[PDB]
Amino acid sequence: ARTKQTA
Amino acid sequence: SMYVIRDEWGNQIWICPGCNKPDDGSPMIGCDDCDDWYHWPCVGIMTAPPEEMQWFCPKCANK
Ligand SMILES: [Zn+2]
Ligand SMILES: [Zn+2]
Numbered sequence: 001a002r003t004k005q006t007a
Numbered sequence: 008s009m010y011v012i013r014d015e016w017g018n019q020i021w022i023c024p025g026c027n028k029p030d031d032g033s034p035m036i037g038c039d040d041c042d043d044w045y046h047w048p049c050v051g052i053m054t055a056p057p058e059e060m061q062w063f064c065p066k067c068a069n070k
Contacts (some may be wrong), residue, residue: 001062007034
């Protein structure tokens with residue numbers, strides 16, 4: 001799937 | 008619907024439809040139908056799905 005985590 | 012706000016710098020900030028709160032760097036997942044982004048806990052995602060698996064949000068999953 002498309003996931004993100006920036007901090 | 009419309010879940011993207013712009014700040015005074017012109018940057019786009021995504022809002023989670025599950026809780027109406029912004030992206031805060033904690034993990035999110037993007038719906039492969041409507042393209043809204045959700046916080047993982049808000050949609051019961053406890054770890055990253057398989058890279059190949061598409062994910063659909065609760066609204067779209069019933070469509
Ligand atoms: Zn949320
Ligand atoms: Zn969706």
